[PDB]
Fold:
Amino acid sequence: EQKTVVVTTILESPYVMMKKNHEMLEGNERYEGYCVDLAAEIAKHCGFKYKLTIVGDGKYGARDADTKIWNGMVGELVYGKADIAIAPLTITLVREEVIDFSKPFMSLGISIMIKKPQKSKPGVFSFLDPLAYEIWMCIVFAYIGVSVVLFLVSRFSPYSESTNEFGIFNSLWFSLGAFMQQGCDISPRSLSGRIVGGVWWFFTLIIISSYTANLAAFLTVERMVSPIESAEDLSKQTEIAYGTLDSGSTKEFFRRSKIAVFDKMWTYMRSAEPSVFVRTTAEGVARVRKSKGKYAYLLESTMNEYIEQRKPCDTMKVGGNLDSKGYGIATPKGSSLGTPVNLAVLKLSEQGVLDKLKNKWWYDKGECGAKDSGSKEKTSALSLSNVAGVFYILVGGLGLAMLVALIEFCYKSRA
Amino acid sequence: EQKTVVVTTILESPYVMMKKNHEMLEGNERYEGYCVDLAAEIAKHCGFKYKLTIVGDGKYGARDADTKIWNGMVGELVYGKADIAIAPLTITLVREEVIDFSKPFMSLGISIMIKKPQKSKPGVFSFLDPLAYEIWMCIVFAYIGVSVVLFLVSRFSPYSESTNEFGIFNSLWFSLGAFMQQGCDISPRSLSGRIVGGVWWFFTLIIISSYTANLAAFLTVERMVSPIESAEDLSKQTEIAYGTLDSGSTKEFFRRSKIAVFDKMWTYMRSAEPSVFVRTTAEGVARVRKSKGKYAYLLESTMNEYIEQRKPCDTMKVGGNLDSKGYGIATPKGSSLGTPVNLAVLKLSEQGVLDKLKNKWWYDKGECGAKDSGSKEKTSALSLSNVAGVFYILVGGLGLAMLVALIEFCYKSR
Amino acid sequence: EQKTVVVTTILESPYVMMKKNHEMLEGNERYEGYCVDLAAEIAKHCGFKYKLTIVGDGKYGARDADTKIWNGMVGELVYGKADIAIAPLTITLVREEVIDFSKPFMSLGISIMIKKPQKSKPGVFSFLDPLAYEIWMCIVFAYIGVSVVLFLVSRFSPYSESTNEFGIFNSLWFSLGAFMQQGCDISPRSLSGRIVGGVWWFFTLIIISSYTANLAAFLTVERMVSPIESAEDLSKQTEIAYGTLDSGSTKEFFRRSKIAVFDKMWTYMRSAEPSVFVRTTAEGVARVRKSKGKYAYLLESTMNEYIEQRKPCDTMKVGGNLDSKGYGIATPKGSSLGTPVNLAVLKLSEQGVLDKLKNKWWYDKGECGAKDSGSKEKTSALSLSNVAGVFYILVGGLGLAMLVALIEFCYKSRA
Amino acid sequence: EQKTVVVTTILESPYVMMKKNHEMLEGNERYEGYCVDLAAEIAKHCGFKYKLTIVGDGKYGARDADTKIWNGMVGELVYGKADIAIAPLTITLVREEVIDFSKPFMSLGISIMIKKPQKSKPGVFSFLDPLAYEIWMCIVFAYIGVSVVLFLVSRFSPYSESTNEFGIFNSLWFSLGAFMQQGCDISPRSLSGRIVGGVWWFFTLIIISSYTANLAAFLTVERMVSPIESAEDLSKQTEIAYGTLDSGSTKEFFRRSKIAVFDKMWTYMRSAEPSVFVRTTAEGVARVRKSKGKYAYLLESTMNEYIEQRKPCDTMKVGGNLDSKGYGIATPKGSSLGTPVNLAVLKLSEQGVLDKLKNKWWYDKGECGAKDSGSKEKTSALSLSNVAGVFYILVGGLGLAMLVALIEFCYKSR
Ligand SMILES: N[C@@H](CCC(=O)O)C(=O)O
Ligand SMILES: N[C@@H](CCC(=O)O)C(=O)O
Ligand SMILES: N[C@@H](CCC(=O)O)C(=O)O
Ligand SMILES: N[C@@H](CCC(=O)O)C(=O)O
Structure:
């Protein structure tokens, strides 16, 4: 052995994660993840020891403005602080000119991530929502007064007061049957009473119509929600905001491309304020979760499709991949080990362990059941929950009437 | 000029804007006069130092009557206190008399701006809206006629008369209960009466279904409708006062205008009470936003559009352009600089840099861009104020209902 | 002297029009219009003899790139067959370099033009349209059958047929009461009759709801028509095609300006086939009038304002002016007439005689001005006409029942 | 001294187009398109002389079985008919090892294409649809319970036998007459009975209002049917058939892909009985359009998005595409032409000129703006089919109703 090769790597799940008790372990053993396995396979096949090292400045890095200095992991490769890079370093021309890459071993595209919109489980009494509290309260008050006036008018000295059935209790019973439009078994005969009947009928006719119309409009508006799709709406949408990782090559791609859609996006991202960019993936996704709908995030599809299956399961992909790129193992210019590394990559590809490792690492952590897949878009049908409440009132009424009849029996058996 | 010039300029947000560090920036670097420094191409060719200098009077300037004294920009040019102006100033013959002008770099016109309309409170009797007056009337006459005809045939000589309930009072009662979809105990029991009952039921079914459908449509889609649209409306104006900027050449234009509609407008604005004119852009803006429903302000369309995208997005252009005029460079008569700089404007129009000059200010600040019907806030509950009218009718009817009973009681007292 | 200067002009209303008796008249009096009047003021100020001449090739003309031979009126002015031109020749830089122009005497803007949307005249029976013919037919049969079956089953012997009131006529009367949801005076007694009643009730309950829902939808859709406004979204609309005059200045404007919306307009004008372009203003207007709704036209606003006020009145302005331009008297390079002509124009402008002409040729010619004022038809409410039909049925029913009572009298009166 | 080369190409409609003067022109003039002007630009940079020819086999063509002797388009290179290929051909290692390939000029991947869905014939019982299934049972059980409780409370010794009319049969009849608003023959005389009578009315009012509202919502903004969410479903179902273009590189990709779903799909298509593979793009299109969506076709998405715009717009992409692959120029081993064109491809790749070509050959050909619903349909009346179901129920009810009377009469025949 000549020397242990110094390897640079940057923390991102599931490529690299801290071990449960890494502070107790050896420097190489401190880490666990996809890249730890791939590095051990390279170490086996190429036959040399290695030292895992975290990137000190913690970013992939790009050309510095107006200085042409390189920072990040790329910086560590060109200024000789380390010998080989095993990390999600993406291949693009502007860095190919100064560092060398192996053959690609994984494929990816750009993706968009948003919060899941809502969980709108209907309330036990949502059916009242069209009319609001005040109207119901005033309807209740009017109900009483109508019966009281009808009764008082109906019973007075004909100066023969017994010649009508409109007692107090019947004077209540009539208004309720009137209000539900169920008709009645009796009719008032006085001029005053006929006036009262007319006006209560008109009141009913207005109210029921207004309620039905408003409810129809309410359900119709919901149908046209039309959520954002295919990333095209973000060309014109402006209530939403979006941004990307800093110093990543997503940013270079957006500011360098000239396709009118992505040119418009870059114009937005360079003019939108305050700064939409974010310095780490973890707090970027935390920013999306906090914004609870208003801020979207752009990221590599591999990472997006890792996250949405994790425990919180509160976010999802939208749209397809916008382009295509690949990952590669990287090494300094003219490093003689680089071609052995390419051979190792080719052999591990042919042996299919690149499949083995991915099938190990992604699906086991996919503990979310992926329920509510969207394969049944409500079928427009009005579910029982939306009106459930109404049955409770009916059942309670019938339950009450039993007790009423029982006390009526106990009365009639002793009065 | 002494190989040096002080370029007359005015702070107007679409064309010249103060930099933040204005306490310490000085010279042209206090601003971003990209609207000028391309026309300074000939200033580059001649190499003379140019200072973008604030116009001393802070205004477009004017020419007095009688004395013909020239104010602000105009004064300082004609008095030789300044030498060249690249200010956003209107081409007009009254100024061509004493100064000369380049080819205009862009064209614009008179525009009119009002406070953006907003939904008002519902009327107490707004529950009537879906059917309009005529139908609400005709229903009544139909009801009367139907009751009378039901009465008549129901009291044909039975062979003894009055062998049925159907008196005129009872006939009105029956027809009223039948319209409202309520339990009516008595029955025609006879061919002509049954015929009358049928059609009346059909009629009431159709009316009710129409009303509910139309209201449902009404509550889904809203349109505020602007109250005015044209200069003709401004000639038929009820209360909304209007006037141009003071010292603005549009005012002189109105004084000059001979066409009968504009002459009537001018004579009104002359005969309107004082403080009908305003002296500054900010004053007009503040007056318009203060004028919830009382005043309207006239300004150039380019400023109107430049404001419309600012915050708050609560003002709007209405109507078309009233005329057309150019904006251009102005200079004292016969200046050795004013002649060749016209070549700059020409060749820059050929280069088409005018498009960049526009975009950099009107479109880079698009900000408050397109809003449309895509998604809406929840319609929310129907408020109590929107149907309140109905309750008053009910309580009024009940309150009335007692009096008839009391008078009946007193009537039968002897 | 002056050798009878020749003036070129192109026929276009209202600038120049044929005299109705031009078949036999001679001289400049053979014409009428704005321009032939204005020629008299030029002759007044210059004091020369002149002749009107019709443009042979009938178009204003353009560079005709790749051959670079001018044509039209401009052709006649540059190749020396025309001494001076007085016509709606607009001033543009590509012309000023070949020919001189005077000071502008009138101002113009470009405008869009469209057909009126035809008014939705109500029908005498428009109220039936929600429910389609076949259902209206079949309801009658269902009614008849139900009534007959109810009668037959009601009056079959219970083991005695006098025990129920459900005679044939009463059986016909029950069902009509039931359909309109207006209750009834009597109820079927037997099990079979109760079954029939329940069935008919369910049927009517479905029908009435379906009718109301459909009608509400039908009205709602009408509201959101949202017709083309400001006409710039013709850059986004594609169902409606639009043309432009050939060899006119408008045809140059869309190639020569380079604002993005006009770029895509010009791209459309390039690609659309059959060609949107047209040879003469009259037949372009004819194209718009016949190809109602789906076709549109671009023209100078002065000409549009002339057209839309004429008696056919079937077309209108839309949107504002796009830019600003003017017309001037024109003359060859170095012609001595040019400056005298400019002085004449200046004098007539200051003397306001330009208006003294214009007023005669537009304000008197307009004879259509009907616009909604004071109140508006379109606002919200249903017209009487929309439900007119219903009142006729009611009136006819009441009118019919009189004759029934009269024949009832005629029967009994000789018993 | 002089030298020329022969080129292979294929008439793929977005990439190469037959010029109308197809009778007698040369291949360097017969054709236009993305491949044609790409080749012209390449020859502009590299300077070499060439002649265009169609691939003589006219197809991609399959590998020779068990020998892999190359197809026409590759053989014309390997067997010296041509020296350079510029065609929509997939980059793959099974080809790269035999011939060299340029840097890819585009990145693309497989997608499904299916027939655009259309309105189906309405179901005979579609009148049920708005109120959902479970509710209908609850209504029935509530009706029964209400009738029983009414009867019991009506008859549990209200003080006794014969004191009231409310038999159990009559109680059920009352319950039914109260729901569907109609004539009420009798009424509860007692408090408990009136309580029972009350709430049922409120319940029926709510139910009816809800149904009629929702149906009206349904008939505006239809937005219906989505038969396939992704090829996942296509792997779960078996009714709709599918397959790739024959000899296509998709077939080789599936032949060796280790993903369980794709391996299942491969084993199925290999095991599929009828002719699932098609030889030409035209065949795949015609087969899909014919099959009314019962067959689905796999292709590279860059064709799919082009065909989508070629009217009629009756085909659509679904799913977010499958994978990523490159298209590039190819060159046989040892050919000197290889690197001097590869450097030109690199030049074009870095200069971005390809974006002009993409605009010229895809986006300038965009026509089908009906995607955005640029025109608004107009509603139509309900057909008899859309409600026909209820009539059968009515007639069946009457038919049943007649039989009871006869059996009753026969029962009372002794
Ligand atoms: N780490 C990626 C970028 C990741 C991202 O921006 O989402 C790169 O090397 O560019
Ligand atoms: N811009 C105008 C002032 C505003 C106005 O005329 O109303 C001018 O140059 O005088
Ligand atoms: N004669 C007009 C024609 C206007 C047009 O049709 O565009 C001109 O000078 O261009
Ligand atoms: N014809 C291309 C693509 C076919 C496919 O998509 O499988 C090739 O075989 O290279």
User: Anything to note?
Assistant: Residues 384-414 of chain D form one domain.
